[model samples]
Target chain A: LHDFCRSRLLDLVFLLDGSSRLSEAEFEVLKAFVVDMMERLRISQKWVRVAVVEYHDGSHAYIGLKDRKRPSELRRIASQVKYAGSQVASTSEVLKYTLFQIFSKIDRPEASRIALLLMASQEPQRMSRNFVRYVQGLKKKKVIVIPVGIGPHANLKQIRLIEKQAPENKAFVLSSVDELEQQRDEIVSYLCDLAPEAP
Target chain B: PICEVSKVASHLEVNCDKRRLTALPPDLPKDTTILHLSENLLYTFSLATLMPYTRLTQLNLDRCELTKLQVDGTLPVLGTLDLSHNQLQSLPLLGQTLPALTVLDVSFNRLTSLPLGALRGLGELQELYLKGNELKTLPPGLLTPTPKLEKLSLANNRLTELPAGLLNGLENLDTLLLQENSLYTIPKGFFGSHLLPFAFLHGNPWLCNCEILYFRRWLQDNAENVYVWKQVVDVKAVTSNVASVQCDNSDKFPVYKYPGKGCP
Candidate 1:
């Protein structure tokens, strides 16, 4: 037995929406953006795996990245991701259930970071008092949440409330579909900055 | 440069299988999280390998000829670890590495003894399976370290005795399988803490003599605890006539009495 020391790897999880909030064309654009960014950052199909959760009225795990180590497999899985169901606009039950899954089910590394990506239009249909603190607790674990408001009906106030759960710069604001393309780069840059230095 | 970027992209599924990329790059857009490394010839791996990609919650390394895995400083936030079919006999280096690990499977290897002192740091471990190995004795502090461990499988080994403090830190243990061993005697206080609900003690030559007198008492006291061989073998009948037979009260085989009574 040797007393060896290794650097702690930073852990992060992204909560994406595959619900009926995005149009077909918008979903396609989002897919391209996600795949391209992963490729650009060298997260390759082998060393990185992603989980796709579909949230509409309720949320369930869709695609689990257990051992997808091929670029082609990653592309196929990412392509297979489709919008789940849609709701009028509320983020309480789904948000609580999603957060519980992330904390309880997902594997978390010590000293790791986490983030959430909420994409939808309209304010969350329901808001529990614990929702704000829950999001803030996620941030305390170093989870960065980027809430993107799409379309005119998307409630900026609710998005801002969720953003307040994280640190100042750690949150983002997206007002239009056209602006989403621009914000994608910002999120990627944020991810790169949070990445642990190579050992 | 007009940074025409997409906002709040939801990445559902990502697969990084066997790209042979030694190191991870920084900066991934919002929706990337899971990482897969199966059937690769990876010699070394560290937390820096996932640099700038902090959202990774799940990782798989099956069928990799990984000779060395250092969990010393990295993986404080890691949860699930599947290093099956690797060349690992000891995990002394992973003492405090994975504090949040819940499911750990190290099956089908040549591990005889688990590092007792090194495992005291895993306070949150739940399911531990070390099946199909060459372990003669359950290491001290193995159960105590993981207070939350529910299922422990130590099948197929060479154990003759269950030492004291074997069940010290097993407050939440539900199932314990010690099948397929050479256990001749079941020591007093074997089920020390009374927290077990299911225990399997099959496939061993139980002496059922003065050596096993306490075992008979334990079975009577713990009739509710599951013993797989009860219907096939009668412990009480075999030990009923033990006191009738005159045995030498020597130092090697000292006469033992019941918990309350003195030597007859």
Candidate 2:
């Protein structure tokens, strides 16, 4: 695992939905997935860099790629993450912030970039053209967007649209928190392979 | 004359990548905003040559042979400067000259240390990248000058420890990358002020002891803010929350464990 990370560089960002729709228990499941995936990879400054953004009505950068912490420190921080539980949810707004503000903040054009968006909400009432352009722009910039639709309330159609703008065959839809736990190994395996072969 | 000139947006861009050029173009456009001169053979760069391009905002000189930068004066509007993959052992004073400069990249250089007050003039500086350098220790109040700094990268350095108040005035700091260093224990009050969302501290040999108890408690309390939770396996095979916090001398002090608490 360490050898794989040392060779192929990766910059990964996580966008977790903390909207009113996601239950506290479900949020724990999402945090577990993040922890599980992190444990499998050999994270370092030169290798795999990780960041996190939590969103409800809007988004906040919970962690940045540059903020390095020990594994225990990271886990402890992850445990303290609170659900925003805002009355309204805007995945597009969060996506826009993640792409422009968060992603650009840690811009490493040479590294393989991945944005893991875990969301559970209905599609926004209006998906503006600007949002579409931002998603397409991320695709052009070689940002692989993995949209994970959690629970039955998740809008798979919207998630599919996000995945369509990302790299091919890199989307997942979970029916329930239990299913997310069941497929934990699969998710971790796929993320571990997200880094492309070194040139 | 070998450079390809084009206009991007309202600014003129000059592309001179892999040009094997020995010096700056004498006839560069006066209104040039972005300059790309990566993968070149230039060994020396004098900022005096860029005096004409007062509108210049972004400059890329990556993968060059530049060992020195001569900045007689600042480029008032210059915002982004990339000097990555160079042979620079030191940097010219930038605070007074590049007042509006927000992004500065000096990664992959031979800089052993930055002089105190190196970035005192860059008040608007937001992102500073110093990855892959020979920085051994950051001077006291090194970041006191740039209170607006949001992102700082000091990865792949020889830093053994950071000064306790190194980040005293950086209130807006959100991302701090200190990975791949020789750090054993971080200062107790290092992250007291702000709730940093993205902090990379992996790849350092951490000595988990009473000194790290405060950091441990902070982690447990602020788990929600942590972006990644790296796992650390101990001899007991127990996936302890504090497992990732290891001790260099285990015989002297056994790893302290956090009394597991339910998530809020």
Candidate 3:
């Protein structure tokens, strides 16, 4: 467990998968998990900001980092995200590409440490080398990438690689298709407790 | 404290890449400009330490593991800030401060949307590179304040559409890159003749039949601006699929006034 900053801002970025497999009911469960986590972190709409990216098919990604500020606003944006169950694309590729895109596009604050939460289920068709490079690069950049493998199709190897890339033993792995509903809370709590690197 | 310098010639370059050094003396000389501390393991730096060197034009700290820009309230002549490649997801409060900044490179971080509002007061901003982030939507009136913005790069992002009332203030834009996005339709009146001179449109799978007629025509007319327009111009040939699907087939298929068979 990373040390949590007592009175510092923690920037949490939640990367949600709105792929074809995600049902309306599963989405609702995911939404509930996020809300409960935010409430636990006390991440007010003002202090904490949320950005979302939804991926489907290969190369068809949607980024909504610039949405309503409030938690409700973020929830509404997430809920509205359309998921057209395109099952052929690899989840690992999406993860890699999304990280590359995020690092290349998003601007970071010098004061606040970052935490990335990836929620997805499925394996990559062919894990590209760029995917591995991106994960290594993200780890070097101090981004605590948490890969949540929900459902039986979730690739445990990739999730372990993601966790292994964190600073020391700080990353996590929760393997369970049905346990995701409850696992969301555990993951959020783990992230909320993540402390900023010793200032 | 002199901080121990060899004084090599009239200039000095420090490449502190990924070193675990913490604080620097507050009174460093003014001739220090090129400071590369990328991929370092440092968290914060006081603006007072970096302010005395008013000639700081280029500072690269990509992947420096920094969280907050701990600068003072003012940096009169500091330009060219490279804060990319860090763990920063939010920006520090430097608005109404840092008056003379022009080029800001904040790419490849965890930012969702840039704090353009913080940069409105800066009168001399010309180039802003914010490519490869998690930004899904370009905030309305985000660039309205910057009249002198010449180039805006938003390639490889999560944008779905050009939000309504988003491009009203960018009157002096020369190049607009929207390649590799989720945009489907070019909103009517998306570009006025007075705004962007060149636009990079590709990567997005648009229904290039009717709604895109204006876009195609606009690109045709602004050949110089859309020099790279041929990359995605093949989508115009997607007529057979459009007809078969019986999608909104408007007769107005953007007639080109002057061109050699549209984008080759």
Regions of candidate 1 where Cα sits further than 4 Å from its true position: A1-199, B1-13, B16-33, B193-195, B218-264
lDDT value, residue A72 of candidate 2:
61
Q: TM-scores for all candidates?
A: 0.45, 0.58, 0.46
- The RMSD (Cα, Å) of candidate 2 is 14.1
Q: Give the range where candidate 2 chain A is weakest over 10 consecutive residues by summed lDDT.
A: A123-132
Best candidate according to lDDT:
2
Mark the regions of model 2 whose C-alpha exceeds 4 Å error after superposition. Answer: A1-199, B227-245, B249-264
Q: How would you order the candidates by TM-score, starting with the best? A: 2, 3, 1
Which of the two, 1 or 2, has more TM-score? 2
Worst 10 residues of 3 chain A by lDDT: A59-68
Better by TM-score, candidate 3 or 2: 2
- The best candidate by TM-score is 2
Cα lDDT listed for each candidate = 0.53, 0.71, 0.54
What C-alpha lDDT, on a 0 to 100 scale, does residue B57 get in candidate 3?
A: 59
Worst 10 residues of 3 chain B by lDDT: B234-243
Q: Write the per-residue lDDT of candidate 2 for residues B167-255, one digit (tens) a residue.
A: 78888776677767888886878888677655566556767655766666666655433332232231011011223444455443223
